[PDB]
Design an enzyme around this catalytic site. Sequence first.
Site, PDB file in Angstrom:
ATOM      1  N   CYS A   1     -19.117  11.397 -11.658  1.00  0.00           N
ATOM      2  CA  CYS A   1     -19.990  10.942 -12.630  1.00  0.00           C
ATOM      3  C   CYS A   1     -21.366  10.580 -12.008  1.00  0.00           C
ATOM      4  O   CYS A   1     -21.501  10.012 -10.901  1.00  0.00           O
ATOM      5  CB  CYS A   1     -19.270   9.827 -13.358  1.00  0.00           C
ATOM      6  SG  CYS A   1     -20.468   8.853 -14.492  1.00  0.00           S
TER       7      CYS A   1
ATOM      8  N   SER B   1     -23.200   7.929 -12.309  1.00  0.00           N
ATOM      9  CA  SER B   1     -22.940   6.622 -11.937  1.00  0.00           C
ATOM     10  C   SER B   1     -22.716   6.405 -10.626  1.00  0.00           C
ATOM     11  O   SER B   1     -23.050   5.388  -9.968  1.00  0.00           O
ATOM     12  CB  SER B   1     -22.187   5.740 -12.930  1.00  0.00           C
ATOM     13  OG  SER B   1     -23.086   5.447 -14.320  1.00  0.00           O
TER      14      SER B   1
ATOM     15  N   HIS C   1     -25.454   7.180  -8.486  1.00  0.00           N
ATOM     16  CA  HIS C   1     -26.386   6.053  -8.713  1.00  0.00           C
ATOM     17  C   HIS C   1     -26.050   5.025  -7.410  1.00  0.00           C
ATOM     18  O   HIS C   1     -26.780   4.152  -7.311  1.00  0.00           O
ATOM     19  CB  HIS C   1     -26.209   5.206  -9.882  1.00  0.00           C
ATOM     20  CG  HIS C   1     -26.987   5.885 -10.960  1.00  0.00           C
ATOM     21  ND1 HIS C   1     -26.639   5.876 -12.336  1.00  0.00           N
ATOM     22  CD2 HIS C   1     -27.926   6.893 -10.938  1.00  0.00           C
ATOM     23  CE1 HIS C   1     -27.507   7.066 -12.931  1.00  0.00           C
ATOM     24  NE2 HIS C   1     -28.165   7.472 -12.172  1.00  0.00           N
TER      25      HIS C   1
ATOM     26  N   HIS D   1     -14.799   6.112 -10.445  1.00  0.00           N
ATOM     27  CA  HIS D   1     -14.444   5.148 -11.750  1.00  0.00           C
ATOM     28  C   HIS D   1     -14.081   5.975 -12.783  1.00  0.00           C
ATOM     29  O   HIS D   1     -13.464   5.575 -13.956  1.00  0.00           O
ATOM     30  CB  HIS D   1     -15.488   4.386 -12.075  1.00  0.00           C
ATOM     31  CG  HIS D   1     -16.684   5.097 -12.582  1.00  0.00           C
ATOM     32  ND1 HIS D   1     -17.572   5.950 -11.884  1.00  0.00           N
ATOM     33  CD2 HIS D   1     -17.094   5.180 -13.985  1.00  0.00           C
ATOM     34  CE1 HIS D   1     -18.500   6.462 -12.766  1.00  0.00           C
ATOM     35  NE2 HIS D   1     -18.326   6.069 -14.125  1.00  0.00           N
TER      36      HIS D   1
ATOM     37  N   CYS E   1     -14.197   7.875 -18.357  1.00  0.00           N
ATOM     38  CA  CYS E   1     -15.497   7.703 -18.531  1.00  0.00           C
ATOM     39  C   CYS E   1     -16.228   8.679 -19.118  1.00  0.00           C
ATOM     40  O   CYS E   1     -16.650   8.535 -20.354  1.00  0.00           O
ATOM     41  CB  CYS E   1     -16.042   7.542 -17.132  1.00  0.00           C
ATOM     42  SG  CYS E   1     -17.747   7.439 -17.183  1.00  0.00           S
TER      43      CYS E   1
HETATM   44 ZN   LIG Z   1     -19.196   7.107 -15.353  1.00  0.00          ZN
END
Ligand SMILES: [Zn+2]
Length: 374
Positions: A46, A48, A51, A67, A174
């Site tokens: 993902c 994120s 990030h 996650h 997610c």
């Molecule tokens: Zn995510």
Amino acid sequence: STAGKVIKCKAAVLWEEKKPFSIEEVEVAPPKAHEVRIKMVATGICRSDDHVVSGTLVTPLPVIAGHEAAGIVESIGEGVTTVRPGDKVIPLFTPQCGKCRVCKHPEGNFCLKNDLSMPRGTMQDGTSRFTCRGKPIHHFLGTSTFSQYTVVDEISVAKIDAASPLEKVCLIGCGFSTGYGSAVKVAKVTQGSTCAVFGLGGVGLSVIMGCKAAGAARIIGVDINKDKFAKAKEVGATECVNPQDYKKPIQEVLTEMSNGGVDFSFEVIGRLDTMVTALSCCQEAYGVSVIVAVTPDSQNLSMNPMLLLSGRTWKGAIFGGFKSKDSVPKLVADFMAKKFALDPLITHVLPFEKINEGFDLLRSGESIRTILTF
Ligand SMILES: [Zn+2]
Ligand SMILES: [Zn+2]
């Protein structure tokens, strides 16, 4: 055989910022009370997670990210009552302690027991179950799926269908849940309605899928990359609009197209400019615009409240506004019941060890979703 003692395994460790993931031999400590140890089967990559890599999402380092995943419970700590060894499980980056004001509130899902707001990078008790050469390794959002084995608190895991394809249902951790939920739960898209989705990546496709499920009559996909339109229409998009093909502003094009503004607009890229665009483009008296994502490196958007005074509703959510533990199992159920497809999202599959490569695919944007199999 393995329960009760430390497990030696490989995990994707990020020692510093803007550094590739390093495949290290880590020691995953046994689960203490109300904790669950999971053998990862499949984890998604993902934005994120990226990030974390770029320092955009500030969290303690070194850390084991991830996650979005699924796997098998290898063992449980004393007290764990919601899952048992052998159970197929999906970890929850957004907890459901079922005790805080939020968990108790019928409209909230951002459980106060989260580690998103003020990152600690640990288990609930403030410690870590990770060590690499005796050195401690931080947890990520109480999940840390980038490991062959991870340990999460009971509030951060949900038991799912024992016959579900973990290589696919991991997206419920997610990606899918976020987009889909934004349409179905957050926005609460109505039948015959016109929707406008900004950003046709994995999450955008999930939103589109949510609109199609909700019975939207029009699903206008918006993105500057034409290569995302086929997958879009394939998942529900009735139309696709590339802003670069137009001379007039995009909300003007979307307003006219919807004969006065759309019913529901979703921004899924995280862009400050398109956030305001999405909002504007929905009908002034009863439009609803949803913020599905916002880049961690905070920056304020400039917007005129007049856009709200006429009647528009602006709101966002995390994990599609779903109460994690309650929703996840049902979503897997609905998948097992063929109520939606996940395959259109899965565009690349790599062995866990080629994680870096999977991230390269992400950053290049030639990927909708990469799944790392263990
Ligand atoms: Zn995510
Ligand atoms: Zn809670």
